[PDB]
Amino acid sequence: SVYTYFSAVAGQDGEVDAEELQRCLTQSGINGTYSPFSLETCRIMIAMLDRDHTGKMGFNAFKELWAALNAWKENFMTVDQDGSGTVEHHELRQAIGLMGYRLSPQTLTTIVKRYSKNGRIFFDDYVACCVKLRALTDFFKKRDHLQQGSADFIYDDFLQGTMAI
Amino acid sequence: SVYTYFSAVAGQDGEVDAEELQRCLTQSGINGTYSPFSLETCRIMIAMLDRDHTGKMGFNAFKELWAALNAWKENFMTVDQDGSGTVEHHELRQAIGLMGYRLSPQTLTTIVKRYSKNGRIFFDDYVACCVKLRALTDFFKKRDHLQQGSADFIYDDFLQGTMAI
Numbered sequence: 001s002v003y004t005y006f007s008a009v010a011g012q013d014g015e016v017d018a019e020e021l022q023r024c025l026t027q028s029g030i031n032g033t034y035s036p037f038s039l040e041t042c043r044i045m046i047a048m049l050d051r052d053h054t055g056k057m058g059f060n061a062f063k064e065l066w067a068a069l070n071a072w073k074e075n076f077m078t079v080d081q082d083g084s085g086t087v088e089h090h091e092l093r094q095a096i097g098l099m100g101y102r103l104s105p106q107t108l109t110t111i112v113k114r115y116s117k118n119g120r121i122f123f124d125d126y127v128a129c130c131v132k133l134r135a136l137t138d139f140f141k142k143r144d145h146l147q148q149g150s151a152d153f154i155y156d157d158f159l160q161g162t163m164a165i
Numbered sequence: 166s167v168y169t170y171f172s173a174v175a176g177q178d179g180e181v182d183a184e185e186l187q188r189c190l191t192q193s194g195i196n197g198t199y200s201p202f203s204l205e206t207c208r209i210m211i212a213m214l215d216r217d218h219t220g221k222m223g224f225n226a227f228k229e230l231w232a233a234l235n236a237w238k239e240n241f242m243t244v245d246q247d248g249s250g251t252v253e254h255h256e257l258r259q260a261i262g263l264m265g266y267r268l269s270p271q272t273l274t275t276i277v278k279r280y281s282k283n284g285r286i287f288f289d290d291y292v293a294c295c296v297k298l299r300a301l302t303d304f305f306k307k308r309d310h311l312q313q314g315s316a317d318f319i320y321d322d323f324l325q326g327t328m329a330i
């Protein structure tokens with residue numbers, strides 16, 4: 001059924017832009033219960049997989065996305081002690097350590113304060129956070145040639161990568 | 166009358182969070198004929214001036230924002246060679262070079278592709294772009310101790326700064 005929604009909105013190139021992706025995911029039902037995704041979330045989604053640097057996404061990259069979404073949806077549900085579609089600060093920190101990140105308390109704090117609406121973290125923000133977390137790390141790893149946990153960036157390169165995400 | 170909108174929505178702390186800032190700017194009228202700001206835009210606004218790292222904004226910082234908004238709105242109008250309210254790729258590159266940035270073609274292209282809707286760039290995305298452009302540069306500058314156009318980042322520090330923006 002997946003291809004059906006993709007194709008339904010895909011362009012002449014068989015690729016979707018952030019706006020079409022949004023429609024596709026929504027018409028998809030993946031977030032059926034929860035808060036539908038925002039255009040900003042969808043833009044980060046594309047940037048996370050835009051290796052050809054076109055601002056669009058093909059069905060092969062979409063399949064990777066889909067895999068990642070259902071995985072993140074799973075974690076959201078398992079930290080969702082209860083139900084309502086919103087997680088708590090603590091519930092969020094636990095989800096992040098669950099995806100394999102080992103961030104410090106201050107950084108985690110920053111991240112949470114970034115996506116909080118009344119001590120709550122809605123589904124959309126939770127997924128935006130997951131996608132951005134990955135995109136940034138991939139960008140950083142590519143600059144950390146010896147994998148030392150540090151990297152040197154030249155201004156223009158630094159900007160191009162972070163503005164894109 | 167600036168303070169009136171600020172205080173109308175301001176919290177117990179006399180500070181506004183992203184959500185209240187949105188209400189304030191909107192109720193403010195600065196949006197002209199253009200499109201109203203989005204919550205995402207407002208969050209970058211606060212992050213751009215959040216020196217105390219609280220996720221909120223006081224009236225002193227708000228004054229700085231206001232100054233920058235009016236300035237950005239001026240440029241938007243001057244590149245809008247046809248009162249569309251939306252600018253074009255070229256009109257956008259022109260506004261970026263106008264704010265003092267000397268970015269390479271590829272970088273500029275990436276930036277444009279990030280905020281484009283059918284070859285159009287709405288006011289909200291245009292302001293989101295200007296805010297983010299400055300926030301990232303400020304972060305970079307702070308790590309470029311000798312101002313050489315390059316800087317070394319430790320992963321956790323890198324994430325904290327970019328996730329906040």
Ligand SMILES: [Ca+2]
Pocket residue numbers: 244245246247248249250251252253256
């Ligand atoms: Ca125009």
